[PDB]
Structure 1
């Protein structure tokens, strides 16, 4: 299952202490992302040093012997320092690019001197990186302009500014000086080896793919939480449905969901709900839940396949010419053409838009009383709704997020211009595409943060609902006895207490126009008819007036007590405990001062910085 592969990705990301750069051990997107995000992760270049020097020698002798092989170093770098600071590629991306550039050389096809590789290693471990303009690459003879800034650092160009950690910016030659390095004087083919690769596009695409797997698994998992809160029928995940339409991502997501929902205490509440007034409620869930596995299928497959493609690129020699020193020939091709990454970046951006639309459809259902099976509009607790608009602000923002996300998912690869004196008449635009997919993942993080917040709100509201119906049942039950109503009447009255959704009358429970009093009034009239008397009327008028003696006070009490349980038996407990306890939040209401921003910011940040993987792994403990 892709579920276990993604868990393995998350574990490797968390665990790794050293990245082995050796020309043989694959670097994964978890490693790239760990190097980028955890500064205690260090690069360890292993002395492959043999084939690197052989290659280097072959090129360096074909220069002393003055052979003539096509593919002065500073003039290439000078013409490529052609970006403009409007915005810039971040340090995480630049350091990622440095690693991929370093790695590309280990295969001994590039001809760069080993010491330059050592210099890359040192700069990475020292947190030194050049400041690199955002735009300029068409990713075809490589990410020429942006990679030119890394080469510019290595030769100590004064106009290239370098970061050292988060606070220090110094000109290139001073940055080299501070790490015990001297400017390089570039040798034959070395300018081309540094600039003509796919390392920047592939860097962005690596952090993008790592993020895509994590958010994918997170969205898939949270479909189970959605089922629980919406009162879904878990049967949509039944293995047979998916065995007869056997898209691997359809089987595998359904598999996880069947497992997440199997012994669910909310599924138990769902069953009791559809048993009451059975033939007046929907027989099936709406599509955002019920067809989630079918929806997820191509998205899982796209994100998994793109990961393979990007990792192949991470582990490639991607400059030109390729030096076949063994056979004494320089090979003229175009491994710097980033099309594998470019095309898949367009595809993943479409899959991410599809994940966003799934979230938006689910969130929409949750906000609307007609579609939420008992939950209040906007997940508003009230009880006073005139001053509690609940999650309406987050609802509007989810439309804002989905709309921009769908716009972002138009392709970049369809916009190929005939470039560089028509030499690059096809070019991948991989870095541009990767940037747009990254931007699309930023918006999906917002949507996840919002969706999880809303579901924790719904958990609270479902737990509060169950306790409120119990209060009502007890108040009706005991008052019925005290007024001396017959058992016919008592049971009829109790059915109403059970059946009427509590959020439809919580605002003013004893309001004669609201659904509780309406149901009791019709039951009182049917009792009079079934039993016919003047005494029965006395006790029924007594029952009704004595409703506003106790009911409201007891509903308020059990509520206020909740503000100051089924989730404990649910596989999503870790998520709820993380958002409520660890992040320090509570059921949203007019009485809680925190804005939706404050609550959702906490969840968003935990998604951003990877803390959310903790409750996620917890939740999936034992899944095989």
Structure 2
């Protein structure tokens, strides 16, 4: 997988690919100039015995003292060691790779005053598929997680390779590297930034997108299973409202559903029963979710390319300036935004499941099973979906509204973006479980409409499932079916049915 990186130009689709699979990358030749020039600007400051905070000074007491060169170099190690104070579970390699590539992208923009050779080391680690240990918690939005990553550069910490933990030195050799020594500003360049926060929210974004796509397919099947109407998806309704998300959503439903199906055609005159909101307001509810994840994607798309460390080096003017780009407030809001979409996608789906369980609603046997006097059918699966949908409401509580003061009142407001981002992964597992159950139920219900077929793309969704899970004939161990369905969705089995260009990264 060759990627030739033009720093600051990653697209959301590129980001999804980095997240999904190993990468091979190289910096574009056009990146060298600005990168080498911020180093030269740093080198000049030092050569001219100029004092610059965050460049050649010590801290606090020494924040204006030109720390001797000797202590300057060891100050970088001490920063990284002391800052590597994270805790909790190890991030998986996929997420570690994204963070590494985000850091490379940002440093490579030439505002950080870090040597190209350090950047090249990180790249060597990516290319070698050597992923430094990074613990899940600690950042308030990303000193700790970025400090854990950088440990390996110095020959400290540990890293994963071929799924086994290696010592840093062992790890470095795998990548054809030897331990490095950091120079002025490099410690800060590596530790300051929003790459972990951004990475966490991006994974939430990609999950949110996979689930949107799945939900269009499952909701289409459910519509068919209970003989719902295609009228709610009429373009005229959506154009008259003017909401773009909803207009795009409805277009997706029409594409998947078509004008009619054998199923729909064989439910002749009757269209006298208006469909419940969980079917009929799918464009409106799923469109709102689509708009919401597009808003987040835009913010996160920009942040993936942001120059986020501090202080910034402006070689062109000779200036070094301390600002607040390491504050990940926009990332935090984007994540809280995504929370709303993942929850409402799951909520609308659970009510569709609920409908399907109701023989007064479904025009199907109660709980989707033949001879329910002695068979419980899907009844407890529906309960599982309610439990999962429910959990998402509390999980929806925003993290972007909380802050505690740190660094002795000097970092008196922070974003809490890492917590905001990572709760999204569990919300997505809940909504994924809900959709898997909807998937199972709608194929069961369509099954009961003996011999009848739905549309072309929805029939592919039925075959996808039925190749792993059989029709529900009579009560049997239920959980393995749900497990199966969930893995299918997690593997993107239905994503490909959605039309192109709808979702930010797809």
TM-score by length of 2: 0.90
SS of residue matched to 2:166: strand
1:82 matched residue in structure 2: 85
2:472 matched residue in structure 1: 588
- 1: CA distance between counterparts of 2:174 and 2:277? 60
- 2: CA distance between counterparts of 1:419 and 1:61? 33
2:223 matched residue in structure 1: 227
SS of residue matched to 1:336: coil
1:601 matched residue in structure 2: 483
Q: In 2, are the aligned partners of 1:232 and 1:270 still within 8 Å (CA)?
A: no
Q: In 2, are the aligned partners of 1:221 and 1:256 still within 8 Å (CA)?
A: no
- Give 1:80-159 correspondences, 5 Å limit: 80-85=83-88, 87-139=89-141, 143-157=142-156
**How many Å apart are 1:164 and its aligned residue?**
1.1
Q: Which 5+ residue runs of structure 1 have no aligned equivalent? A: 1-16, 276-281, 464-564
**How many Å apart are 1:614 and its aligned residue?**
4.2
For 1:450-507, what per-residue CA distance to the aligned partner results, in whole angstroms no more than 9, with x for missing partners?
Answer: 11111111110122xxxxxxxxxxxxxxxxxxxxxxxxxxxxxxxxxxxxxxxxxxxx
- 2: CA distance between counterparts of 1:195 and 1:51? 20
For 1:576-605, what per-residue CA distance to the aligned partner results, in whole angstroms no more than 9, with x for missing partners?
Answer: 111113x3x3211227x5x32222222211
- 1: CA distance between counterparts of 2:283 and 2:298? 22
Change (3 A) 1:255 1:205: same
Q: In 1, are the aligned partners of 2:359 and 2:366 still within 8 Å (CA)?
A: yes
| Count of residue correspondences | 479
For 1:520-545, what per-residue CA distance to the aligned partner results, in whole angstroms no more than 9, with x for missing partners?
Answer: xxxxxxxxxxxxxxxxxxxxxxxxxx
TM-score by length of 1: 0.74
For 1:425-468, what per-residue CA distance to the aligned partner results, in whole angstroms no more than 9, with x for missing partners?
Answer: 221111110001122112111111111111111110122xxxxx
- 1:67 corresponds to which of 50, 75, 83: 50
- 2: CA distance between counterparts of 1:414 and 1:38? 34
2:59 matched residue in structure 1: none
- 2: CA distance between counterparts of 1:611 and 1:354? 21
For 1:60-107, what per-residue CA distance to the aligned partner results, in whole angstroms no more than 9, with x for missing partners?
Answer: 23123321011111121122121234x232222111100000000121
- Give 1:540-555 correspondences, 5 Å limit: none
What's the Cα RMSD here? 1.9
- 1: CA distance between counterparts of 2:499 and 2:285? 23
- Give 1:282-431 correspondences, 5 Å limit: 283-372=273-362, 374-381=363-370, 383=371, 385-431=372-418
Residue 263 (structure 1) aligned with residue 266 (structure 2): no
**How many Å apart are 1:617 and its aligned residue?**
6.3
For 1:278-327, what per-residue CA distance to the aligned partner results, in whole angstroms no more than 9, with x for missing partners?
Answer: xxxx6311111111212122211011121111010001111011111010
Q: In 1, are the aligned partners of 2:214 and 2:489 still within 8 Å (CA)?
A: no
For the pair shown, the structure with the greater C-alpha radius of gyration is 1
Residue 56 (structure 1) aligned with residue 45 (structure 2): no
Q: Which 5+ residue runs of structure 2 have no aligned equivalent? A: 55-74
Residue 33 (structure 1) aligned with residue 23 (structure 2): no
Change (3 A) 1:448 1:228: same
- 2: CA distance between counterparts of 1:124 and 1:163? 11
- 2: CA distance between counterparts of 1:303 and 1:220? 15
The structure whose RCO (Cα within 8 Å, separation 6+) is larger is 2
2:159 matched residue in structure 1: 162
**How many Å apart are 1:570 and its aligned residue?**
4.4
- 2:428 corresponds to which of 427, 441, 451: 441
Change (3 A) 1:569 1:240: closer
- 2: CA distance between counterparts of 1:572 and 1:283? 23
**How many Å apart are 1:423 and its aligned residue?**
1.5
- 2: CA distance between counterparts of 1:177 and 1:569? 55
**How many Å apart are 1:568 and its aligned residue?**
6.1
**How many Å apart are 1:211 and its aligned residue?**
2.1
Q: In 2, are the aligned partners of 1:153 and 1:162 still within 8 Å (CA)?
A: yes
- 2: CA distance between counterparts of 1:389 and 1:570? 31
SS of residue matched to 2:320: strand
Q: In 2, are the aligned partners of 1:145 and 1:195 still within 8 Å (CA)?
A: yes
Q: In 2, are the aligned partners of 1:29 and 1:209 still within 8 Å (CA)?
A: no
Q: In 1, are the aligned partners of 2:258 and 2:455 still within 8 Å (CA)?
A: no
- 1: CA distance between counterparts of 2:415 and 2:110? 25
